[PDB]
Design a protein around this ligand. Structure first.
Ligand SMILES: *[C@@H]1O[C@H](CO)[C@@H](O[C@@H]2O[C@H](CO)[C@@H](O[C@@H]3O[C@H](CO)[C@@H](O)[C@H](O[C@H]4O[C@H](CO)[C@@H](O)[C@H](O)[C@@H]4O)[C@@H]3O)[C@H](O)[C@H]2NC(C)=O)[C@H](O)[C@H]1NC(C)=O
Ligand SMILES: *[C@@H]1O[C@H](CO)[C@@H](O[C@@H]2O[C@H](CO)[C@@H](O[C@@H]3O[C@H](CO)[C@@H](O)[C@H](O[C@H]4O[C@H](CO)[C@@H](O)[C@H](O)[C@@H]4O)[C@@H]3O)[C@H](O)[C@H]2NC(C)=O)[C@H](O)[C@H]1NC(C)=O
Ligand SMILES: *[C@@H]1O[C@H](CO)[C@@H](O[C@@H]2O[C@H](CO)[C@@H](O[C@@H]3O[C@H](CO)[C@@H](O)[C@H](O)[C@@H]3O)[C@H](O)[C@H]2NC(C)=O)[C@H](O)[C@H]1NC(C)=O
Ligand SMILES: *[C@@H]1O[C@H](CO)[C@@H](O[C@@H]2O[C@H](CO)[C@@H](O[C@@H]3O[C@H](CO)[C@@H](O)[C@H](O)[C@@H]3O)[C@H](O)[C@H]2NC(C)=O)[C@H](O)[C@H]1NC(C)=O
Ligand SMILES: *[C@@H]1O[C@H](CO)[C@@H](O[C@@H]2O[C@H](CO)[C@@H](O)[C@H](O)[C@H]2NC(C)=O)[C@H](O)[C@H]1NC(C)=O
Ligand SMILES: *[C@@H]1O[C@H](CO)[C@@H](O[C@@H]2O[C@H](CO)[C@@H](O)[C@H](O)[C@H]2NC(C)=O)[C@H](O)[C@H]1NC(C)=O
Ligand SMILES: *[C@@H]1O[C@H](CO)[C@@H](O[C@@H]2O[C@H](CO)[C@@H](O)[C@H](O)[C@H]2NC(C)=O)[C@H](O)[C@H]1NC(C)=O
Ligand SMILES: *[C@@H]1O[C@H](CO)[C@@H](O[C@@H]2O[C@H](CO)[C@@H](O)[C@H](O)[C@H]2NC(C)=O)[C@H](O)[C@H]1NC(C)=O
Lengths: 331, 332, 331, 332
């Protein structure tokens, strides 16, 4: 039994906050990954979006005798954290709970990371409940916070700044973000990879057309944070940490550079990365930055290219976990 | 001097809540019971209903050589016979209900005094005095030890806001008063039929009583109407009533089965019960379930039949005190 | 040097309060009493009313061989506590200070009691200052209170009830009252002795026509309290304590009953009392209750009749000091 | 890093008050003084007046064999030459004044930085940085230790509300700035005449300077105009100025009497003073009292003549820091 801890605040407050928790489970063989279904015994209202079938290009490597053979094909996965637009943003109002997983994989095995997001009211209704994923049971524990006004962060009770203007103590908090595909008809407002390129590039990249955004939750509970929100200091912070740690923040053995075709029907290579063996470390899921219409990739045993300074064959991860410093008061 | 504690909340809140408290006094001889009058020195607006004259059949037993029972019609005053709507609208009318029930053996009665009223009394009043016969009762209004809930067996507990459909479980006190209320057609007020259905008993016909219970939960709440089908608490109270028909706020020595005529003018027996001696334990007041028009009974030294599985000669108690489990949150 | 202590509150508050203090001085011979003038070096605005000439009937006794010879005459005194209507009541607004004395006398000597009443602002302007009376110097000391919300009473900090409605701790406080002559054209609203008679009499007195009232200060500082104010619990309390202790509340040797003519031009006796010797105990000043127009009396060596149960030949004292219980909070 | 403390009151109150603080920095060489610029990283609205170019006569002395003095006209920036109305209306305009005065010997100057501004700065700002040449200044806004007054030599003191006509006495700091202000006819602005009358000196004619002092009392106050006849504090400040014309915020070795030409184009001497060496003690800036149009002087290593009993060749200082006794109430 794994443990997914939810830190519950003393009050609901302004209505629009969500709780979030997550746990990384033990390794399962690859052949079992396509069968994985999240089950819930919990007394909450599961959003059905994530358990539908979702098309991915599977990209894999084998030793050959540069010394690699890669290949790819299109398959359907279910239960992954591909959250539709507005679902997280309006979950406090709809009273919907999002439960989904990401995959961190080597060639032969995957560690699912289960994410649970939902309304703060769940803390009134629920002390503990169970999720299942394949053969693993997950104990969700809702636990009331030691603090009076904030959250337990690095063993310290902390409340961040709230005002919209400019004016403190500084505490480093966890941020968890989910990639959302969202197109507009006209212009470049949703061209997410262009935002990264302005932050970390010298010269002009021609074709990074992916349209979407990240939706993030800060700490154990917060209102959703949209990335990018141009004049928000927290958005700026998350983007900068993403730009320097594109596979998130926290033995794996690097073998070499690999390329491949995504989707597999492409005549030439559209993706690159670094093949590895040993313990999976980063998530193995992302989207090509080059296509407006998302091309989703699952690349077990390969760290797909996420360096924003590169122009071609790069990706954005489906989920991203890191840390940002927040100004506020320790109490 | 007895002590009647009122637990006062920090705020009035949504306006319709009432405070309630109650105390059981020492035994008084039976001959003094017909003279008992509640006096008040308190700065609140007493509802006058309960101090009017109210006709009861008095049913008593004597050893013979075996039992001899007898009955007669008398008038009592001050008992908890609350008219319809009085408790339900007390928060709006600003009326205070003060009345007693009687728990009696053959020779003595312990009055239980009940005080119910608007939460505003907590602003106007720290302490005041009630008198009953020769006993003085100190009413003490005290702010609650809890932040938001109520002190329940030494624990601060806040119950869920009551929802129809959909953390901690605490057993809380419920106090209920029987209200006689007729409607012109149908069975919506046939309270004893509700009990019969629950105890799986469909053959009865002495179940024409029309009325309901009005209850307060803990030390303060809004009134709870029994039965209300879509309130989970109503279902709980009815079960608890069905299992403990004489309440559970509680040596008493059982002697045997007795019957009698209520009212005394009946040609055959209309009531049964169990004669006892020793310490009065349960209340000695109720109504026959068989008559649409209430026949009120005072039966000192007899536990009147309240088992809902029986069809004939049974009764409903005038007041009922018991306990139900509530879901909620225990403070800190 | 005598000491007149003023207890100063922390704030002025609602504007209309006055401070009061008083001290009883040592005995002076009678011949010196007619010369007594209050002098002040204090930085406050003295009301001039009390230092004007004021006609009194002097009533005195001598042993003779019932065994007494009494006599009387009309004389002018100055500086006594004969305060005009409205002066105390509006002193907080006018910023006037009242300084005057009453006399407590035996046949040969008088102890003046000096009263000082004035605006609470004096506590900002003044730490100490000097009054003189004949050959005595009086040190007025303004001292800031130990308490946060109330006054030091019996070594305890106390704040009385403030609301106009009915609802506590109970503390006994000093009350000091001054008799004010005030006539109306029509009716019995100002017939002060009639109020006493209703409280303490069996049958009907014919002729107690004095018109006036008492103005009182409670503790070391308060707003003026008018006696009688019919629906005020404090007025009721003061009147009852007056009725049971008509010469005030706190060795003197009683000799016998005496009568006399007030004013001295009366053909028959209009006043009675009890002759004494030894240490003066009560004040020796009052007014006849019988006359609408005040007949002021100074009766050294005689306790003038103040028993309200009597109908004829009785008086009201010019000043009155006693104690009443107040409901409130000790803190 | 130097420290400029601002004592912040609990409330803003009647709207027209300003906070003031000041700090004297370490010595800097003379050659660097003409390059000194105040920089600010603070979140307040700096008034631009004081950072403009301002013409001064520089008057200096050298040993000879006896003294050789000389003078020339130069432009300084950043000095406390505040225009009329700027301090007086700063609470309404929300402008902050930051400037320095100079206290100099022949070879080095200690700048004294003054910061004056609206009390609202206390809401917006806990700390910020000023720079002057190579020195950093930490401005620290700190809530007052007192309930209502100000910390004066380790004692909490609240002065009387100032009344014209009519408890404790505390000596408080006053800081004043000289303001040049002409009027078209009469002697209402002839500041040096006011001083002359007070020191009993009616024969003088080099007293045509027109202007006044604007002062702040303690760590915060409303501006005080000197002279204001019906303000008791004005009378006190003028006396204190007359007795200590170079202030009293304060080894210095006196060498002798010197004279010079201000401006340098004058054919005869128009200024005198006392040459010194060692630690600069007083400020080295002022204006000639003789000219209606201000002639500003910077005299490093010379205490310019400020004795009001003298008629000719005298000056008024640009800033003045001293102490006056105020009536009020010491807290607890
Ligand atoms: C992808 O990652 C997975 C998980 O990180 C990884 O598979 C695992 O590898 C470890 C070690 O290589 C396996 O560990 C074994 O566990 C059994 C359980 O009883 C042990 O008995 C074994 O012990 C023997 O082997 C050791 C060899 O050094 C000895 O030290 C020891 O004394 C014993 O002789 C053994 O350690 C584990 O079972 C798998 N896990 C899974 C889920 O299959 C995998 O290697 C990674 N893939 C690649 C291609 O890198
Ligand atoms: C009216 O009241 C006044 C004041 O209360 C009163 O006059 C005072 O009387 C006392 C005692 O009768 C006088 O006391 C005297 O004081 C001098 C001062 O030095 C003493 O030396 C005297 O001492 C001798 O007398 C005593 C007699 O018993 C002895 O015990 C003693 O050892 C000495 O021999 C003496 O006590 C006081 O001076 C006057 N005060 C004034 C102000 O005149 C007066 O008696 C009262 N009048 C009436 C008519 O009752
Ligand atoms: C009806 O109930 C009442 C009250 O419970 C009973 O009266 C009580 O009876 C008990 C037991 O007989 C008496 O006990 C005695 O107490 C005295 C104290 O004065 C003691 O000295 C004796 O040794 C004895 O234990 C008690 O006095 C009495 N109490 C009162 C308040 O009257 C009564 O017995 C019951 N009646 C029946 C018919 O069972
Ligand atoms: C003008 O004032 C400045 C500053 O007060 C004077 O400069 C200082 O002069 C003193 C005394 O001559 C110097 O003292 C020396 O300090 C050093 C420390 O490095 C010490 O090692 C020596 O033994 C000695 O005591 C000091 O350095 C110097 N300070 C600065 C900040 O420059 C200057 O003398 C004055 N000029 C005139 C003409 O009086
Ligand atoms: C991210 O991508 C850029 C571009 O490929 C890499 O930048 C080059 O790095 C090498 C060695 O650090 C330098 O010698 C080159 O001059 C860099 N080129 C440019 C255009 O910047 C960068 O190192 C990559 N970051 C990684 C792999 O972490
Ligand atoms: C309530 O009344 C019913 C009906 O009279 C009682 O049921 C009887 O119980 C005994 C013991 O279990 C059985 O031997 C009888 O056969 C039952 N009779 C019927 C008709 O059901 C029941 O005991 C009563 N409950 C009490 C006294 O608590
Ligand atoms: C106040 O005056 C009344 C009336 O003169 C006194 O009352 C009389 O007192 C005596 C003895 O106490 C009784 O025997 C009389 O019956 C009373 N008469 C009346 C009419 O009440 C009273 O004692 C006086 N109070 C004093 C001197 O303190
Ligand atoms: C201020 O200037 C006056 C006027 O020059 C000085 O007064 C002289 O003081 C000395 C010593 O007391 C006397 O011997 C002179 O006769 C005074 N002259 C005049 C004209 O009054 C005074 O000393 C100066 N004050 C200072 C330097 O503090």
């Amino acid at each position: 039994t794994g443990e997914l801890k939810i830190e519950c605040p003393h009050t609901i407050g302004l209505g629009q906050g969500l709780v979030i928790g997550s746990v990384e489970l033990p390794p399962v063989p690859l052949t079992q990954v396509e069968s994985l279904k999240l089950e819930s015994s919990c007394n909450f209202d599961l959003h059905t979006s994530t358990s539908s079938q979702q098309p991915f290009t599977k990209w894999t490597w084998e030793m050959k005798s540069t010394s690699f053979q890669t290949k790819s094909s299109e398959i359907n996965l279910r239960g992954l954290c591909l959250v539709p637009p507005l679902v997280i943003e309006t979950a406090a109002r709809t009273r919907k709970t999002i439960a989904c997983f990401d995959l961190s994989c080597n060639q032969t095995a995957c560690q699912p990371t289960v994410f649970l997001i939902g309304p703060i009211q769940t803390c009134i209704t629920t002390k503990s409940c169970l999720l299942g994923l394949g053969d693993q049971r997950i104990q969700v524990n809702y636990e009331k916070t030691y603090c009076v006004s904030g959250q337990l962060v690095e063993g310290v009770c902390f409340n961040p700044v709230h005002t919209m203007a400019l004016s403190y103590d500084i505490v480093t908090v966890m941020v968890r973000c989910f990639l959302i595909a969202k197109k507009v008809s006209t212009g470049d407002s949703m061209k997410l990879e262009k935002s990264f390129e302005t932050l970390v590039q010298k010269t002009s990249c021609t074709g990074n057309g992916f349209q979407g955004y990240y939706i993030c939750l800060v700490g154990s509970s917060s209102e959703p944070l949209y990335i990018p929100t141009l004049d928000d200091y927290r958005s700026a912070e998350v983007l900068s940490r993403m730009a320097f740690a594109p596979h998130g923040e926290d033995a794996m053995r690097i073998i070499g550079k690999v390329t491949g075709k995504a989707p597999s029907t492409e005549s030439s290579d559209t993706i690159q990365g670094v093949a590895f063996s040993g313990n999976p470390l980063y998530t193995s899921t992302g989207v090509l930055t080059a296509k407006d219409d998302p091309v989703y990739i699952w690349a077990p045993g390969i760290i797909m290219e996420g360096n924003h300074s590169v122009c071609d064959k790069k990706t954005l991860p489906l989920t991203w976990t890191g840390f940002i410093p927040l100004p506020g008061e320790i109490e």
